[PDB]
Enzyme design. Structure first.
Site, PDB file in Angstrom:
ATOM      1  N   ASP A 101       0.990  -1.259   0.105  1.00  0.00           N
ATOM      2  CA  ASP A 101       0.248  -0.139   0.082  1.00  0.00           C
ATOM      3  C   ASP A 101       0.979   0.968  -0.516  1.00  0.00           C
ATOM      4  OD1 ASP A 101      -3.037   1.778   0.477  1.00  0.00           O
ATOM      5  OD2 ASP A 101      -2.519   1.209   1.975  1.00  0.00           O
ATOM      6  N   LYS A 118      -9.203  -3.774  -4.232  1.00  0.00           N
ATOM      7  CA  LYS A 118      -7.542  -4.295  -4.133  1.00  0.00           C
ATOM      8  C   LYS A 118      -7.183  -5.481  -3.896  1.00  0.00           C
ATOM      9  CE  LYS A 118      -6.101  -1.346  -1.042  1.00  0.00           C
ATOM     10  NZ  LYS A 118      -4.186  -0.085  -0.131  1.00  0.00           N
TER      11      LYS A 118
END
Length: 266
Positions: free
Chosen positions: A9, A188
């Protein structure tokens, strides 16, 4: 047991609080990951253009899961995108016509009649913003809407749009005075899975590094899951392993452990 993919991330993870990272150290580390044939992936809620600005020398080399899985890039080429039909975009815009930007593959779009101050402000937030006369006329497909309104109106507009756009799009709060309309089933983690499938790799070969609530799924998925030192305890509980915080190169230290073949990679 072999590391074939490292996924990170951005905010609170690969980036420090100043929204920067050690570029020379990461470059040298990436050079070494490439020698070993290990893929590096950035997976974030952020816009694709906001992600690649951090990697001007690697953007056609590494891979991106952008817009929480609505956009996936591999070797500088779009591998996956979400989209609405001409039908669904029509329906969505009808409801909104009761200020917004529509997000397409080639550009973001705004009404030519929209307040000029709003159009000038949006222009700063998107790499390309095109004023258009008619939304049914544009040759693009849309994956996201961003809506700007007085924040007091937000709870009622969310409730209204949630039922009215059910099974087409989901309204979520973003910043002060903003609602995002997102395609509901794009995440994601499933964006990452699309890359794994392309590469014929397994979550068992994956290092994932995260800190925030929306990293939970990716961290659960990966065999070698790492929570940043600044992560909330619930994220630290989900991830199997720990690293230093985002202001002390914690993601780079994970990469270092992979390169060193130290625990848990020993």
């Amino acid at each position: 047991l072999s590391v074939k993919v490292i996924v990170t991330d951005m905010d609170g993870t690969f980036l420090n609080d100043a929204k920067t990272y050690n570029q020379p150290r990461f470059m040298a580390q990436y050079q070494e990951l490439k020698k070993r044939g290990i893929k590096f992936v950035v997976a974030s809620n952020n816009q694709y253009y906001q992600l690649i600005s951090f990697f001007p020398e690697l953007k056609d080399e590494i891979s991106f899961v952008a817009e929480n899985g609505a956009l996936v890039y591999e070797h500088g080429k779009q591998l996956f995108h979400g989209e609405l039909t001409r039908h669904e975009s029509r329906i969505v815009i009808g409801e909104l016509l009761k200020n917004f930007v529509a997000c397409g593959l080639q550009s973001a779009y705004v009404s030519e009649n929209a307040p000029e101050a709003f159009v000038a402000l949006m222009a700063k937030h998107y790499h390309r913003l095109k004023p258009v006369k008619d939304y049914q006329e544009i040759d693009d497909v849309l994956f996201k809407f961003s809506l700007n309104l007085p924040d007091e109106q937000i709870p009622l507009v969310i409730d209204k749009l949630h039922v009215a756009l059910d099974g087409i799009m989901k309204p979520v709060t973003s910043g002060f005075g903003f609602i995002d309309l997102i395609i509901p089933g794009l995440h994601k983690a499933n964006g990452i899975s699309r890359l794994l499938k392309r590469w014929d790799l397994s979550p068992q070969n994956v290092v994932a590094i995260g800190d925030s609530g929306n990293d939970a799924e990716m961290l659960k998925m990966a065999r070698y899951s790492f929570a940043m030192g600044n992560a909330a305890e619930n994220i630290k509980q989900i991830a199997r392993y720990a690293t230093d915080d985002n202001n002390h190169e914690g993601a780079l230290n994970v990469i270092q452990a992979v390169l060193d073949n130290t625990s848990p990679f020993n």
